[PDB]
Symmetry: C4
Subunit: 196 residues, 4 copies
């Protein structure tokens, strides 16, 4: 068995680094199944040359809406669950990570099917916050996915490989996705059908 983190605390990735290069999110988001749950997933990169600490991820849905009483809220914000309640949103960023939002009854995507997706006027805003270990100061890295950048029925190509003791990252596959068989039904639609 090959360790990922040594006793003293130094990680075994990118042999021989120094632990202003910006942080990367995948260009695209995907939606596909994971242990019978529908998920929306994007990948968030690591800082090659340094650690990021009190590191955490969140996501906002920018979508205009009208309240039943008539009130039009242009570009309304509502939080997307990506680990808040369990702490999985507090990241150990030592290699590019797939962040996953389980689309459930409380998810803004509960009712959206594949065909219904590209009709939606919406935008996901991904926000990474953390303190850069060397530097000392707090960072914040943002990116955005509009509808036409969310791919239904795809998965992320694994970037991780282990050769000669260390773990190395194929960075040319970072934004790479691939197609996987996936229902076109909405999350709600899938639970309705299951519950009978």
């Amino acid at each position: 068995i090959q360790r990922y983190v040594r006793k003293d605390g130094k990680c075994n990735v990118h042999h021989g680094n120094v632990r202003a290069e910006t942080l990367v999110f995948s260009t695209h988001a995907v939606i596909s199944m994971r242990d019978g749950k529908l998920c929306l997933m994007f990948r968030v990169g690591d800082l090659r040359n340094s650690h990021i600490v009190e590191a955490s991820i969140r996501a906002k849905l920018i979508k205009s809406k009208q309240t039943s009483e008539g009130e039009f809220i242009p570009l309304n914000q509502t939080d997307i669950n990506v680990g808040y309640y369990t702490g999985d949103d507090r990241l150990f960023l030592v290699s590019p990570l797939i962040i996953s939002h389980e689309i459930n009854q409380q998810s803004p995507f509960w009712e959206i099917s594949k065909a219904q997706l590209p009709k939606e006027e919406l935008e996901i805003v991904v926000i990474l916050e953390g303190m850069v270990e060397a530097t000392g100061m707090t960072c914040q890295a943002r990116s955005s996915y509009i509808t036409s950048e969310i791919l239904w029925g795809y998965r992320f190509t694994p970037v991780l490989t282990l050769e000669d003791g260390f773990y190395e990252v194929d960075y040319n596959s970072f934004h790479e996705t691939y197609e996987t068989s996936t229902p076109s039904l909405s999350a709600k639609e899938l639970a309705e059908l299951a519950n009978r």
Copy 2:
């Protein structure tokens, strides 16, 4: 569809800024209906020239009270729910936002009707905390709403408009409200009546 946040992470608001001007809360708070729930809402402004990070909102009710056992607590503090349990209190402050507190069984306003409002000896304290991106240091901006500054049955005038690619903010409508048809019953009173 016109993006609000670009891939690289720069927002498309106030074309051509530099991303000591203080932050603004609306002068007034309002109470009115939103998807069948009664809400107390105030607006909190953005920092024209910079980002605010680990950005978060909370609110305190200053109200003296007497415990059933006889104990008089002058100017007692109790938290007002404005997103704590879901993370909606963690703000993405890229344009003036309406903060909303759903008046429910746990809300200090559960039992207060329109007529009953102006009799109450109470004060809401709104507190924004965040680290200013450029600067590096933590900010804290406070403001206050007493009874006579909470308007029953109003809504906030939308400040947001999109012209020529960017989103621009009509700041002269920031504190602007308008009247909307709203029940004068208290939140509790409204749920009692509904549940039959």
Copy 3:
């Protein structure tokens, strides 16, 4: 009605201050009734000359124990609830505050009566953490209450008075308590008796 916090955000306390003096906890803790619940309460002071921010309170019980399997844990730590789950532990420290821990089924004090109190080998550790606004750096102020410093059946003397527009603090009554009629039964004992 006399405001405690003005629109611009400056508080109306201690007329004419500058908003190394250390922070004070009350020397003593008390236990007494509040709206039919038994509570353990201590008072935590304010920083005369400055604000404290991301301000928060927690409390630890230092008490040795033996696990049913035989394991002796000298000076074991277990968290005391003083607002965690609702945010009431996030403080707006603009005047000396009574912190309150509702003694319930999950409280380490559930089973302790008045007579049973002074037999207990225990210690409460109160810890205030916050960033000092002027300074910029994080503070931490600790204090401790052993058994013989927790007074059963007392309350805190209110320090707060309003004269000539501003609110002024009688600091000679900070640590002052007074006796109030209170059951000598334990919290559990009180709920058992009530539930019949």
Copy 4:
């Protein structure tokens, strides 16, 4: 009764210190019973010469996995519960502490028995984060336990002793464990058997 923390807030440990030495985790993790619950425990050390503040502990499970749909996640991360939901993960680090993760239905170890342990391809990553009081800047200390470093049926040797007023720490027993009678059944297996 001998205090651990004095009124003014100075702790009574290591008589006569100054309150770059790194922080230590125990080399080994253990699994054994605590009040009828199965627990995974590691010990985390203190900073001899200084306080650590906003101090907190978390733990990550690095374990590759395959989703029922076929997706292989190399070196997948999932949070281990070590106090998140109650605040017991927010540490008062004034002497070496045993961190405890109660192995329950939500714990990744629910299904793992003694014999089944050494077959598992897994790694626990322990991460302490805190601000160093003197310094001002944020620390982060990591360590790791692979399978062969988790000892089933052991406990930690207590390091704490009180002599001449102060509490002193036998640091040569920090990583010391000892055997204790413990079931070889998995956590799930133990609950199945109990529930009949």
